[PDB]
Design a protein around this ligand. Sequence first.
Ligand code: ZN
Ligand code: ZN
Ligand code: ZN
Ligand code: ZN
Ligand code: ZN
Ligand code: ZN
Ligand code: ZN
Ligand code: ZN
Ligand code: ZN
Ligand code: ZN
Ligand code: ZN
Ligand code: ZN
Ligand code: ZN
Ligand code: ZN
Ligand code: ZN
Ligand code: ZN
Ligand code: ZN
Ligand code: ZN
Lengths: 191, 190
Amino acid sequence: KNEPVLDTDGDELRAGEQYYVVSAIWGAGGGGLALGRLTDQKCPEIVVQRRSDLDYGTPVVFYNLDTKDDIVRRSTDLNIQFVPIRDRLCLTSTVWKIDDYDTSTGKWWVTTDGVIGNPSPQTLQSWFKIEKSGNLGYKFNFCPSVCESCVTLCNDIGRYGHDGQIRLALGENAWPFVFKKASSTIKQVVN
Amino acid sequence: KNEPVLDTDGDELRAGEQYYVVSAIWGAGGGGLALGRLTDQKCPEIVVQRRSDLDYGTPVVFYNLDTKDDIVRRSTDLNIQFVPIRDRLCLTSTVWKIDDYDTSTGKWWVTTDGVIGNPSPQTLQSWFKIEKSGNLGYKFNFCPSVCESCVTLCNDIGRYGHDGQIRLALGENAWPFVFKKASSTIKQVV
Ligand SMILES: [Zn+2]
Ligand SMILES: [Zn+2]
Ligand SMILES: [Zn+2]
Ligand SMILES: [Zn+2]
Ligand SMILES: [Zn+2]
Ligand SMILES: [Zn+2]
Ligand SMILES: [Zn+2]
Ligand SMILES: [Zn+2]
Ligand SMILES: [Zn+2]
Ligand SMILES: [Zn+2]
Ligand SMILES: [Zn+2]
Ligand SMILES: [Zn+2]
Ligand SMILES: [Zn+2]
Ligand SMILES: [Zn+2]
Ligand SMILES: [Zn+2]
Ligand SMILES: [Zn+2]
Ligand SMILES: [Zn+2]
Ligand SMILES: [Zn+2]
């Protein structure tokens, strides 16, 4: 029942379709999201942002909580999965999830090896919401409500430098994004 | 400066002194807290509650954020450490800390191997608060203020049965406790 998330063409986002997640702020605001690697723990791959605003990164696909709903809506728990075109460097999943607290940095990082579906305590770390960010794009929000009796973090996602890369983590200042159709989705609006 | 936490004799808690942490609800509400262990895990030890209300468990000591304050006060971050009278089972610390999320239960357990002091992002999981719980004892709360920029859990601590034992975890319904001074030795000013 919530309002649909829109892409840069003004079209409602469709579950199951590929979208680049691109910073709503260009220049020093960077480009799109992608799979990255840390040298101390190369798998699972982490979520990073490309520094070049003309690099849209790797597309993601959204999976709704209600698998019957074709539309991606604001403020509704969903799973997010990178869909790389090239061969896998890691055998962990490319599904986003919130990591365990990192004492070395004070951060709750967005990483991968998440799980699709099965809303439950077991999958709590894999559920994200998309929220409107004022009048400038959207933000990711980790505040799952799939388990009413579970204590959870409830916080927006920002971007933070670590080891020379731009990572995503829970933080006080959300980073805004827009959604751009990947080539496979552009085919869906043309005959 | 917030109001002091009081023990069962009406005396303020002092840092470094040993206190049993005993359920304010007796009978089916159980007894005091103690070090325990899991089946697959001997180390670090976990925080458990004794089922018998005349078993006060293992005493704890409190460490203040500011090492100069000797009084334990409500709604202030502190470290909590078991001081067992029995041989250690582990080389890990007996300092309380919030565990990593347990996907198999949906719980954020209170465990040990925490750290004393050094309020920082590195030690964030080791800082607890004591709050009044209405007309019946005190509750523990995990909601550290030691790192203003850090994102943190912020929740009361309840008691939950798992795998035959009574554990503590973050939860919506806090469990109430009182503090019984453990030793009959002289109350010496630090
Ligand atoms: Zn439309
Ligand atoms: Zn249109
Ligand atoms: Zn290293
Ligand atoms: Zn590039
Ligand atoms: Zn439906
Ligand atoms: Zn991890
Ligand atoms: Zn680290
Ligand atoms: Zn690193
Ligand atoms: Zn105050
Ligand atoms: Zn008063
Ligand atoms: Zn006194
Ligand atoms: Zn007094
Ligand atoms: Zn002072
Ligand atoms: Zn240790
Ligand atoms: Zn642990
Ligand atoms: Zn750890
Ligand atoms: Zn488990
Ligand atoms: Zn179980």
